[PDB]
Amino acid sequence: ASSVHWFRKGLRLHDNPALLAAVRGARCVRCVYILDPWFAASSSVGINRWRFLLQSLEDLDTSLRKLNSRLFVVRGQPADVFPRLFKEWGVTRLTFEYDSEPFGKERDAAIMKMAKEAGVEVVTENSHTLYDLDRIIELNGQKPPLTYKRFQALISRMELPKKPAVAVSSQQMESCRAEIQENHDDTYGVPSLEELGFPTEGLGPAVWQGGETEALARLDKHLERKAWVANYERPRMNANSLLASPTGLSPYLRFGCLSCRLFYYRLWDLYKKVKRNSTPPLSLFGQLLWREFFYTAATNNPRFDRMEGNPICIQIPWDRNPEALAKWAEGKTGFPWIDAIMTQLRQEGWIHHLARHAVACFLTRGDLWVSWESGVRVFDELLLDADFSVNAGSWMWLSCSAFFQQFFHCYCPVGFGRRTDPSGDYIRRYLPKLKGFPSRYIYEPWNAPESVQKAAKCIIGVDYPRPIVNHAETSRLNIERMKQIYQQLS
């Protein structure tokens, strides 16, 4: 038995029911990530996600070193390399973690058609999600739950998520060092950002360090008294919450550097101990259940991330305005609360979900009437924890285009900031052209006494953008357009 475990997500040694599978009958096996660095990356603006991916593989390599093995990044396409890799290695079987998302599925299947017709065995474990998503779907008449309320109900009636596998092996794997070619780094080394086409001069330490190793350490911090209280007990919105938490876990969950299940049965264990209750409210797991919901709402929906062709998305006459979408994307809307969320997003690769809500509102329903599926595009390159299902699902709800949950008033581009962080500490941080402005004026630098803009080294329209629109003006009109879509809706 000689096999291959293929990494795409599930970038982790722990809770890997797929990497476990491959090793049990095996004589000698090898792991792979497959990348064509030459065409992999879509744009100059997407450095954070690729840096995160590459630190992740690098960690995987380090971890696999301690197993006297290494990670094999293979340049090419999962279509051209697989057959060759079959012949050169005589691999008896292939193991990889189930990808639910529509396009992955298709691709995964056509790569199953290939392995079967080449007489190689295949096992998929679904360890990216808590549940077998298909069963949630069959339990509901083989259709996906349309509301979060019904989603919740359906999973309370099913088994509990599988326990984290005891994935990792030493004396039963570490000595599977059959073949050792030292031409290795030259051919299967982990790419650098430059092979991807990114310039890495002047480049600081990643705010969000990749890898399973950073993920597991983060889990532990996440679950200590101070982080617990502040996140799970007395949650309050402060200027500090906007900041990238050292305990944040969303990116690690997305790449699979952390197991969503391990996270699950530890968030439970901590509740059990601290509250002396062995059956916790469902809302405790809220951040995971919403991730599940979406992975579920989209698995049989090839067009989940598009308005038209999507069976659950309201169709709406969004405007085209490429200059507007650009000013938004760049953080040059002229509205400091928005522009600083967009700036943070771009430098760091993460924003707080309410910063997301505010920014999603400004572009869609609130002020510019640009299609949400464009916001999804912008975040797909920028946001560490975005992916097909999670990112589009979220944007549908926020724009008022889907029925996952109760709608809610439009956050204000000027008000909702000064409530959230009155100090203006956040804005001064990400927009240093606006340091010498008093918090009083700062969220609205246009309606602030001219003397100040003169005596603040930045004048509006010259060093900082004049306001894309004015809020009340344009928001007075979209709300009626919004009612119209709903009046005339049956």
Binding site: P311, I314, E330, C410, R466, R476
Partner: protein
């Protein structure tokens, strides 16, 4: 040496300083831009999402049988 390019949203847009630093959105009329939506909607209201009895019921549990979060004059902070 490799040079990736700007993402599509930039390439499709005029992003020189006058657009970035001071482009403004237009000032319009309500009943003009309102009517156009009606026509496009008549096109659109084909997919429109349609559900069935099994699905149509769950919305009542989460939604007011809907203008609730929108039946207002502006948003909620500058009107």
């Amino acid at each position: 040496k490799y040079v990736l390019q700007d993402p599509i949203w930039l390439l499709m847009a005029n992003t020189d300083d006058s657009i970035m630093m001071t482009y403004q959105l237009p000032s319009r009329d309500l009943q003009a831009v309102l009517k156009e939506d009606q026509e496009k909607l008549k096109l659109l209201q084909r997919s429109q999402p349609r559900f069935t009895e099994g699905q149509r019921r769950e919305l009542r549990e989460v939604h007011p049988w809907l203008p609730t979060a929108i039946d207002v004059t502006g948003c909620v902070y500058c009107e």
